[PDB]
């Protein structure tokens, strides 16, 4: 549940399982389940600017 | 492949393989993944074209997930029983019945 | 529900239930069905609005 929640129920809702090609659907799956990286302080200040 | 082409069987034949060695890998959860694959993309290998025609120029999606070998299952599992989680209103079933 | 609404938790809380009795039902194959459901429709309960 923590892995599924981090990947699919926080601030990003993804739709990708309707993709037919197995390689393209698995690339999206593996990147979404790797998670959204913790942003650095420098990154946070760039977004604030 | 040659026999099936001659008899107009629009399906890929079963392939020879060795019975997979007993490592940690569970087969019941992979039978469930095969059931989802057929429900979602089984139409990609359905006998829907009256012509034995594949349009050149159109891209073909990969559907190796419809082959039992991709889920580490072989012809040797056809008459073994597996947990299918309520599929067909049943708890257990053979891979042949699935 | 009242606490979550007050704290602005955009998720349904965990519900009290009795531990299900040991009948024939296998749980591992049903954990797989839950994983597919989140991959396919998890965006329906994502914090996107």
UniProtKB/Swiss-Prot annotation, chain A:
UniProt record similarity statement: In the N-terminal section; belongs to the alpha-ketoglutarate dehydrogenase family.
Purpose: Catalyzes the E1 and E2 reactions as part of 2-oxoglutarate dehydrogenase (ODH) activity, to convert 2-oxoglutarate to succinyl-CoA and CO(2). OdhA has reductase activity with 2-oxoglutarate but does not react with pyruvate, and also displays transsuccinylase but no transacetylase activity. Since OdhA is not lipoylated, the succinyltransferase activity of its E2 domain is dependent on lipoyl residues of the acetyltransferase AceF.
Swiss-Prot/TrEMBL domain comment: OdhA is a fusion protein with two major domains exhibiting structural features of an E1 and E2 protein, and a short sequence stretch of E1 localized at the N-terminus, which is connected by a linker region to the rest of the protein. Deletion of individual parts of odhA show that all parts of odhA are required for a functional tricarboxylic acid cycle in C.glutamicum; the ODH activity is in fact completely abolished in each of these mutants, and the PDH activity is significantly reduced, which could indicate that the overall structure of the supercomplex is disturbed.
Gene ablation phenotype (knockout): Strains lacking this gene completely lack 2-oxoglutarate dehydrogenase activity. Deletion of odhA also causes L-glutamate overproduction and accumulation during growth.
Domain of life: Bacteria
More details: Is non-lipoylated. In contrast, the E2 component AceF is the prominent lipoylated protein in C.glutamicum.
Protein name: 2-oxoglutarate dehydrogenase E1/E2 component
Signal peptide: none
Shown residues within the full chain: 440 to 488 of 1221
Subunit structure: Homodimer. Part of an unusual ODH/PDH supercomplex, consisting of AceE (E1), AceF (E2), and Lpd (E3) together with OdhA (E1+E2). Interacts with the FHA domain of unphosphorylated OdhI via its C-terminal dehydrogenase domain.
